[PDB]
Each structure stands twice: as C-alpha cells, then as structure tokens.
Design a protein around this ligand. Structure first.
Ligand SMILES: C[C@@H]1C[C@H]2[C@@H]3CCC4=CC(=O)C=C[C@]4(C)[C@@]3(Cl)[C@@H](O)C[C@]2(C)[C@@]1(OC(=O)c1ccco1)C(=O)CCl
Ligand SMILES: C[C@@H]1C[C@H]2[C@@H]3CCC4=CC(=O)C=C[C@]4(C)[C@@]3(Cl)[C@@H](O)C[C@]2(C)[C@@]1(OC(=O)c1ccco1)C(=O)CCl
Lengths: 249, 249
C-alpha cells in the first residue's frame, strides 16, 4: 500500500478490546480495585504483544522482562489516551468499554487529580491530531524509552531496534506531513511528547507505590502479576536508579 | 565553658537502648533484620520523646513535628549508630546496641556485608574528624531539621528560626575546640558537608528498607508499628525526591 509494512504489522498485532469486568454505585475504592483488575488483564496483553513485536524477542530475555517492568504503566496510560481520543474525543477516560469515567465519576479529590494528569495524553492527541500510524510507532519507542544504569545485556541489538522504530515513526509522519519543514517540526512535537511522558508517569508511579504498600488498609486489591512488576522495579525507578532516554536535551 | 543549649542537649540525649537480642542462636538473615527493626522501633519511640524535650520543636505545628520525624528517622538513627560505634568500640565495630554489636567478621558472615560497610562509613568519618560530643549533639538536631516538604511547613517561619539557632549553636560548639578563625571556618564547612553527604548514604538505606518492607512476608522480616507507619507515610515520596532536602553547600 502506501502504508509501510512494519506499520501494517503493528496494526495487526494491537491487542483486541479488554473489558474490566466492572460491576455496573460508584465508589473511589471499588473503582480503584476495578482499575487494577483491568491493569492485570492489560498486562497480559502487553506481554503477548511484545512476543509479536518485530525485534523484541531477539533481545536477551532479561532485557525483555526489564523493559516491560519499566514501561508497563507508561504503555497503559498511552493506550488509555489513544482509546479516549478515538472513542470519546478525549473528553472522557475510556479505560475499557465497561469502564468509562467522566467527571461525575471522579469524586474524591486525589482520584480526580490523577485523572487530570492522565487526561493530558488524549488532550495532546486531539491537539496534534495524532494518527494511528504515528501512535503505533510511538508506543514501541515508549517500550524502549528507559534502560538500566549499566545498560542492557543486548544493548547493541536494542539500539538497532530503537533506531529502526525511529525511522519508522519518520515514515509514519511522512504519510501526512509532506513538507521538509512541517515533517521535521512534527518529529519534534511527537518526540517531545514522549520525553514529557517521563515526568507525567512519575506522579502515577508514586501514587501507585504509595497505595500498594498499604493496599490492605485501603481495601485496594492489586492482582498478582501487577503486584510483581510493582515490587520488582517501582521503588528503584522512583529512586531514580534507571536511565530514562530522551530525544531532546 | 559549654554553652547552655548544648548542655541541655546532653541532658536530654536518649539513654542506650538494648535490643534483647539472643546471641545464643546463629545469625539468620530474617532474625538479624527483625531484631534490628525491633531495636529501631524502640529507638524511634525514644526520638519522639527526645523531640518533645528539644528546645523549639514543640512550638512548631504538630503536623510539622510529625512530618520532620517521618522524614529524618533513618538519618537520626544511622547517625546515632555512628556515634555509639565511635564512642564505645573505637569506631571499629557497628554498635547497634550493647547486646547487638557486629564486628567485621560478623558483618562478612551476615548476608549484608555491603550495607554494613556503607553504614560503617559514618563512624570511620567520626574517627577521622575527631568529632566532639558538642558537635555531634548540634549536628543531630540539624538532621531532624534537614528536609522539608516541597510546599514548606505550616510553621515555616518558626522552623527557620529554630534551624538557624541550631546552626549558630554548632558554630559555638566548633569554637570550643577550633580556636583559630580559619580553622573554625574550615571545620564548619567540613561538618556541614558531612551532613549534606548523609542524604546520599541514607538514600541507599531507604531503598533497601522499602524493598524489604514490600517483601516482608516472603522474607519473614517484622516491621513494628511506628516503623511501619513512618515508612508507609513518607518513604516512597522521599525516594521519589518529592521533598526538599536542605543543603548547606
Ligand atoms: C495512579 C495509578 C496509575 C494507574 C494505572 C494507569 C494506566 C492504566 C490504564 C488502564 O486502562 C487500566 C489500568 C491502568 C494500568 C491504571 Cl488506571 C491502574 O492500574 C490503576 C493505577 C495503577 C493507579 O490509578 C489510580 O490510582 C487512579 C486512576 C484514576 C484515578 O486514580 C493506582 O495507583 C490504582 Cl490504586
Ligand atoms: C538497610 C536498612 C537500614 C537499617 C537501619 C539503620 C539505622 C538503624 C540504627 C539502629 O541502631 C537500629 C536500627 C536501624 C533503624 C536500622 Cl539498622 C534497622 O531499622 C534496619 C534497617 C532499616 C535496614 O538494615 C539492614 O537491612 C541491615 C543489614 C545489616 C544491618 O542492617 C533494613 O532495611 C532492615 Cl529491614
């Protein structure tokens, strides 16, 4: 087609729709447990996606697991932004077809604040008019956007993969942004959106880990696979003991 | 010839606290950490009582007092470990308590030799500097007052007055021994740098502690009541850097 084959591949490997299983009165705590229930199902889906993503299975298995444990929440908030942009024009948060939040369902002050943070992504998607082909290549680069302070075991292959998906994003931008000046500026805008996600996700990581270490008292359930990625890396990530990659100074 | 506020600090200094540790039984990774945290809980209770006696502290807002103890406990307790090790065993063993003393061979046998080396840095620095009791008592008050919230304190004006008063007192304590002008100025720089350096050493202890707390059931490590409360109140936020560490340099 005019659509490059790697992008059409990324489109075919996107996860199908995941339901939260929410029991449809609204309450902050039961809402949070439903959000983490959904997060467990989405985590399964991200690891399956990774198994089909070109290049990723060839990195050392420890690097595969480290990059999923670093990037899971960033990938899931970026997909929440896509669904919300696409289904409700960014104006509600479309966590799943059975768990769509508007402002009436955001009652407790810290819950609404966290939603506003997440709401930044679909607002930028609406402003910039991000395309599916852009979003698919961006989402790979977010998987690949933090490494350990000592680097990865397959650092060479990693660097090759990340360059390949930067070239692919350039192709995605080229589908629509025809000028030299305009497609350069578009590359800048998209890559700076990805750099800015590191600071957005830090607030969600802190709230997550604070809730997780008193989850019993809070009556907030975290499922087993999500509890493992939290316990394995979150405190180290929050402490700054990882290397976030940036496109811009 | 000792200034009255320092004599007061000496008078209110906690007494030595026993761990009640059973040195019949060989060290086990779980039993050694559980006994360390039981002793830490008793030392934390004592720091709370000390703070009720420390001039100025009871006149800050009660939420400020709680926050400053939640931010500084680890720093206070490591600094107190350093002083007892220097005073009682010439700095050459870690003197957690009179019944819980780790010489280097017991450190090496423990599963925690690296952590023990990191904490044993502090008494070795006290030996190198020949820190006096009057300098230590003032430095320890400044560790209580060495981090504030990003938004400041409710009693920010009273806090600054208090913290400046204890800086002035450290300057008087230096003057007891350092009679020359340049020597005295250099010693103020050295001791205040020692304090600034402790932020980085304590970050390492805070990360291990929070990982141990998350994994406490798996690892059979007990965390007593007040210790748990302060870890769950602030430790993720401190490790995220969402507080303001005060530096002298
Ligand atoms: C602030 C965090 C960040 C949250 C994730 C964002 C990314 C995300 C997107 C999804 O579509 C489904 C689940 C997750 C993976 C989230 Cl909503 C949940 O697990 C729920 C998460 C972890 C989190 O969400 C909230 O606290 C929250 C979300 C909305 C309002 O409060 C939380 O700590 C639950 Cl206790
Ligand atoms: C690495 C940390 C730092 C430790 C504190 C240092 C400061 C301290 C000084 C004490 O005398 C009593 C207790 C504490 C408060 C410590 Cl030893 C314990 O709670 C035990 C603490 C938190 C800690 O200690 C160790 O892990 C450890 C290994 C060997 C010595 O300490 C821990 O995480 C245990 Cl869960």
């Amino acid at each position: 087609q005019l659509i490059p084959p790697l992008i059409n591949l990324l489109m075919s490997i996107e996860p199908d729709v995941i339901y939260a299983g929410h029991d449809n009165p609204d309450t902050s705590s039961s809402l949070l447990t439903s959000l983490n229930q959904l997060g467990e199902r989405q985590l399964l889906s991200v690891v399956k996606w990774s198994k089909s993503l070109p290049g990723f299975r060839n990195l050392h298995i420890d690097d595969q697991i480290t990059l999923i444990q670093y990037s899971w929440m960033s990938l899931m908030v970026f997909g929440l932004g896509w669904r919300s942009y696409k289904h409700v024009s960014g104006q509600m948060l479309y966590f799943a077809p059975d768990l769509i939040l508007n402002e009436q369902r955001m009652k407790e002050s810290s819950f609404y604040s966290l939603c506003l943070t997440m709401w930044q992504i679909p607002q930028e998607f609406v402003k910039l008019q991000v395309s599916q082909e852009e979003f698919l290549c961006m989402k790979v680069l977010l998987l690949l956007n933090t490494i350990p302070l000592e680097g990865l075991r397959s650092q060479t292959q990693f660097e090759e993969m990340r360059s390949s998906y930067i070239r692919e994003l350039i192709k995605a931008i080229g589908l629509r942004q025809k000028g030299v000046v305009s497609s350069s500026q578009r590359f800048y805008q998209l890559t700076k959106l990805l750099d800015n996600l590191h600071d957005l996700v830090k607030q969600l990581h802190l709230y997550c880990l604070n809730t997780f270490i008193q989850s019993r008292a809070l009556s907030v359930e975290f499922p087993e696979m999500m509890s493992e990625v939290i316990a394995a890396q979150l405190p180290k990530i929050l402490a700054g003991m990882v290397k976030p990659l940036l496109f811009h100074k």
